[PDB]
Amino acid sequence: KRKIILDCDPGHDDAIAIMMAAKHPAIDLLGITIVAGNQTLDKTLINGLNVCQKLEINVPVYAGMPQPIMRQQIVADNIHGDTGLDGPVFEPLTRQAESTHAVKYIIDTLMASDGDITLVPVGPLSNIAVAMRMQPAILPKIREIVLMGGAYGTGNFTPSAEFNIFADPEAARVVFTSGVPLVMMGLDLTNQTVCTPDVIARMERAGGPAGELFSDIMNFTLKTQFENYGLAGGPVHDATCIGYLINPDGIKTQEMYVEVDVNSGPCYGRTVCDELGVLGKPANTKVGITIDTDWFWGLVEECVRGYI
Amino acid sequence: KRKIILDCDPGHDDAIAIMMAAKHPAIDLLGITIVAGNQTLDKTLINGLNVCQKLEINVPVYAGMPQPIMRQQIVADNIHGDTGLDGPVFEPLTRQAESTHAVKYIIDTLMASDGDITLVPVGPLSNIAVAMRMQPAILPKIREIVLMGGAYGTGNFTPSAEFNIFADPEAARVVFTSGVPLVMMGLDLTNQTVCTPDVIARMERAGGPAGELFSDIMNFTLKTQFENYGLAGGPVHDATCIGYLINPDGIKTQEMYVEVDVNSGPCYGRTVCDELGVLGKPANTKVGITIDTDWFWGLVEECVRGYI
Amino acid sequence: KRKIILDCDPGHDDAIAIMMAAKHPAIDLLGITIVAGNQTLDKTLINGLNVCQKLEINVPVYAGMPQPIMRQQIVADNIHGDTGLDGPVFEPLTRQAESTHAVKYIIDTLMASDGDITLVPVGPLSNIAVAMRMQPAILPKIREIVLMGGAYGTGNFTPSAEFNIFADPEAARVVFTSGVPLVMMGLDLTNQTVCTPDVIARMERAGGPAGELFSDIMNFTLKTQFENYGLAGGPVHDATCIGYLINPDGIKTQEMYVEVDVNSGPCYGRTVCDELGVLGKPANTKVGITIDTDWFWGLVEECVRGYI
Amino acid sequence: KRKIILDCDPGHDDAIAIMMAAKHPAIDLLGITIVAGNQTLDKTLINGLNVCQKLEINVPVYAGMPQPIMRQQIVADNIHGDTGLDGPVFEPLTRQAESTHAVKYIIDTLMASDGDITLVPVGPLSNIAVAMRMQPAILPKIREIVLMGGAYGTGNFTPSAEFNIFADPEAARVVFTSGVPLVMMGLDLTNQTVCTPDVIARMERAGGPAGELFSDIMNFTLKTQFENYGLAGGPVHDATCIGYLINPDGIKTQEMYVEVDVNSGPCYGRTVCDELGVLGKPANTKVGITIDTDWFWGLVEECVRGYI
Ligand SMILES: [Ca+2]
Ligand SMILES: [Ca+2]
Ligand SMILES: [Ca+2]
Ligand SMILES: [Ca+2]
């Protein structure tokens, strides 16, 4: 099993990632850490807890950074709605976050570990960067980082930048210069996972708590992702990181030297990816290129069925 | 006919553009202006003159800027050789450049015109930017600018930037903020025109001075373009601008808001292209997307046969 | 009494600041927080504890950030020596740091307070920035921040930047946009406190533990500050913040709009101070202009005598 | 005699510089080149011509760049008025610009020379930068550049930048990296030349065409320089360059390594001056520190009296 800490900002696709991570036998989900991103932390926290309660997921949830490390905070309410998880309606929330701050949880867990834990950040990298600079000794302890973020081609939130990186470019600069093994599921790969109405229907047919939740969630971003970016369905970007850890053969990556641009201006938060190797620098990232969607959606269905 | 001034840094594909522009009846080639780029100006001027002499092109050639407007000069000898036009071997040069500087030629020609002239820049944009800032009254007199440069995806000389723009980002910023009708044949489009051995063979069979010249030229970049960028043949990037003016239906463009990034750093000289229209700014550029290569190679052959 | 938290990177002048803050009856020193700066944290922590043990200061010391929030770490060993506090030799260390992290201490103390605590950063601003972004609710709780850092004219570490800001420009950007009442003792003011041989001799004559310590400390930077910068003596930069809080009439400030430049390049970490108000923006900082050095050295001697 | 070409954007103090340069026997004024700056070129050219006609100065005037090389044009109408030279009255213009563009004039004159000509730029550096990049062979021909621009301390138009540099930072970058001997009369020096009401009265008493002109001109900026920058009189910044060439002993300079910041942001167009030599780079500029104003105003009076 791959031990993971899932760091997220739920978030529609974050919820699908949580659903898969908490169920699949190849993943050992140690804890969920929450960061500000898609919405403010008060909301992404409530959203994370709501998902865990509904799916009866037995994993502690820790609240982290409510703001990025330097920049003026942005949100993605255009895609995710005022709540950050518009669509599903939950019973009154009874579970709460742990007392320990996510940054402390991340540091303490890594330091006490035998170096076998993978971090899976699928929101802005704020928690990760603060942990890395607060306790540099965590670096040798990180097995790998499999993050959803970035784009080698076109961004979403700006032409140059994908949201997670754009929401905290300085934190991304920290992570991308950490020297830790990195896998980047960028938009070039993740936009392939558009969740069209026939995919939603497939998960509805499977049914149960996860099938119902999948439908209520993914129907919302069907509209917003089309209206904003022209996508044929809402991608489940964040779930690709979980897929990658369950079976990396389903995903083609290419090793590249990647740099995060922190210049104010038209490329702030861009992941500059040396696809042709022209800079002659050692690769630092496995960059996602293609995903086998037949495999991927089969895996999603299998996880959904696990909750029946 | 479309009247043009062809501004170039020959340069293998520049030579092919010259060959096409000077021959096709849909183009009225008024003058050739030369800029430093692929090689230093002493070399690109000699290369331009050698090509015109070989093909008996009786169009005046004017020498322009030997250095970019602000940055430290770069060259592309890795692609184009120490001469800037390795491959063909020419007879002793008898023609000479005009005494009028290219910048003065461009300004004077536009100022005296009926507003029907198109600028076709296929090197760094140094001559164009100096002309625009030296005599801003040319702007309302320019019909269109159809330039080869930029990339909405991956660059060549760097991951972020295409060579022409990279060689003078500040000049490019001038041109891209000019407000003049702009067409951009960037690498995304032009990399489709890889001149593979079968395409060279085709032009060899057409024969004559242009067919032989085509072969001697494009066989050289066949090797360097593969070594540097993995390309299956050397693209004839600059010739796409001439093709566009001959028949724009052969090339699909998309209107986009494009900005040139002049920040020192990993995106210096990037053309940032808003493919999805997320910035909510009006388009300023028709950006090349796809080219019909059957049409394009047919047109190249037609022009080649014109010199028989 | 003004309640303070002293955040520092000892550091020769930090030690003088600690000596004054812990002894003057107008200061209520709640706690000392340590940051990486002049040297790595393992060292500035040891230096801070050494000074507290030597002078029998019974204030808790908390260790904070070992690295800046984003940039590559720099140190000032050129000025401060290999240990960070070259000069004095101390008896074996028995004094211990608290187990609580400085960031958590800062946040909890502020949150539990009645808004009457002043922060006094005299190192890089890493601890402060992390606290502000980790718990934004601390902002209304901060009475004032009186920091040593920046320069409106010439920097030290670079022509543009003073060391504390240069060592963490991104953290400084956080602090200077916080909206909290701000006082900046910059180099323009603090270079006025050159500790010349006659000043040292004055403190030697006062004697006792603090007088010996002052001599052993300030004799070191006497040499390093002259060799590296213009300086006739080592300034006691950080002690000016303590002086300011004891009697602000001893220092002339001017209210200015101040911005921290985070651009890579020749002004990275510059504090841009709008001396003439040309930007038309509301002031956010009281910037130090002149200090009454007779008043100041008198105050130092008084504090030194307090340890006899 | 020192042969000069005076490149300017008249401009109140430019006019005083022209008056001195054309009269003092220590200067051989070859030509006046005009650039856009204080106002658009149409206005600065008329202003320059008006001054020459009024004072019967028989020196050719050449019109140059009407826009900076890259940035969006700014003007200083707040200081110089809508005309760029509000204050004096002129008879109908009979004088006109020469037919040769200033950039060509500068190049041709330098290339034909024995290397003994000094350039005296007292506006934005647009003409100079275009000349340097258009014909790099001019570099060794330039004896010295004595420019009015920059500031090692506080700017005027912004806190970071002096107007001439700010109006074309990219051109200034070109000039400051040229390797030509450079003297920089920056604001730190030139602000010492405030033309208070008693100085104006002194020149009125001298009388003649130049005394009357001096008064009409300097009474205008007396008002604007006070309102904008709090200055006690309008400085005659540009005239200090002519003073420097008449008797350099009247001015104290310090050799420094100077870099022009071309970063967009709060230091765009700053001259970063390494006062303390901390960068370990060889000096490239003699930076003005102080001027003997008793000497200087005596020289101004002597020049004024020359026109009686
Ligand atoms: Ca997410
Ligand atoms: Ca070319
Ligand atoms: Ca300190
Ligand atoms: Ca001027």
Contact D38, D87 (CB under 8 A): no
Q: What's the token pair of residue A38?
A: 């898609």
| β-bridge mates for residue B253, sequence order | B288
Find chain C residues with C-beta within 8 A of A101's C-beta.
104, 134
Task: Give dist(CA D245, CA A168) in Å, integer.
Answer: 53
At A218, the amino acid letter reads M
Among D152, D264, D267, select the one facing C272 at the smallest CB separation.
D267
Contact B193, B295 (CB under 8 A): no
According to DSSP, residue B95 is labeled -
Query: Which-ligand-closest: CA of B190?
Result: 2
End-to-end CA distance of chain A: 22
Contact call for B272 and A266, based on CB within 8 A: yes
Contact call for A70 and C263, based on CB within 8 A: no
**B198 belongs to the catalytic site:** no
Q: What's the token pair of residue A113?
A: 């570990």
Residue ranges at the known binding site of B: 9, 14, 122, 225, 237-238
Find chain B residues with C-beta within 8 A of A228's C-beta.
276, 278
At D301, the amino acid letter reads E
Contact call for B266 and A266, based on CB within 8 A: no
Task: Give dist(CA C262, CA B257) in Å, integer.
Answer: 27
Closest CA to C11 of C37, C30, C42: C37
Task: Give dist(CA C280, CA C282) in Å, integer.
Answer: 7
The H or E element that residue B254 is part of is strand B251-256
Task: Give dist(CA C30, CA C307) in Å, integer.
Answer: 19
In chain A, which residue's Cα lies nearest the Cα of C35? A134
- Contact partners, residue D256, CB within 8 Å, separation at least 6: D152, D273, D274, D275, D277, D283, D284, D285, D287
Task: Give dist(CA B67, CA D133) in Å, integer.
Answer: 5
Find chain A residues with C-beta within 8 A of B267's C-beta.
160, 261, 263, 266-267, 270, 272
According to DSSP, residue B308 is labeled -
According to DSSP, residue A138 is labeled G
CA of B213 to the centre of ligand 2 (A): 17
Contact A173, A260 (CB under 8 A): yes
Contact C4, C21 (CB under 8 A): yes
Q: What's the token pair of residue B49?
A: 């003159």
The H or E element that residue B27 is part of is strand B27-34
Among B103, B133, B135, select the one facing D69 at the smallest CB separation.
B133
Q: What share of chain C is helix, strand, coil (3-state, %, to 5)?
A: 40, 20, 40
Task: Give dist(CA C168, CA C68) in Å, integer.
Answer: 5
CA of D163 to the centre of ligand 4 (A): 9
Contact D229, D215 (CB under 8 A): no
Residue ranges at the known binding site of B for Ca(2+): 9, 14, 122, 238
At C64, the amino acid letter reads G
Q: D126-134 vs B126-134: helix axis angle to the nearest 10?
A: 150
At B187, the amino acid letter reads L
- Structure solved using which method? X-ray
Closest CA to B169 of A266, D178, A152: A266
How many independent structural domains does chain D possess? Answer: 1
Task: Give dist(CA C138, CA A84) in Å, integer.
Answer: 25
**CA C64 → CA C32, C41, C69, C127, distances in Å?**
10, 8, 12, 6
Closest CA to C131 of A130, B216, A175: A130
CATH number of the structural domain spanning residue A61? 3.90.245.10
**CA B79 → CA B15, B157, B220, B228, distances in Å?**
14, 10, 9, 8
| Structural domain boundaries, residue B16 | 1-308
The pairing of strands D234-235 and B234-235 is unpaired
| Cis amide prior to D234 (ω within 30 degrees) | no
The pairing of strands B194-195 and B182-185 is unpaired
Task: Give dist(CA B269, CA C52) in Å, integer.
Answer: 54
CA of D38 to the centre of ligand 4 (A): 7
- Contact partners, residue A114, CB within 8 Å, separation at least 6: none
Select the residue from A62, A65, A69, A132 to test the C interface by mutation, using most C Cβ atoms within 10 A: A69
Q: Rounded to the nearest 5°, which phi and psi values hold at C293?
A: -70, -30
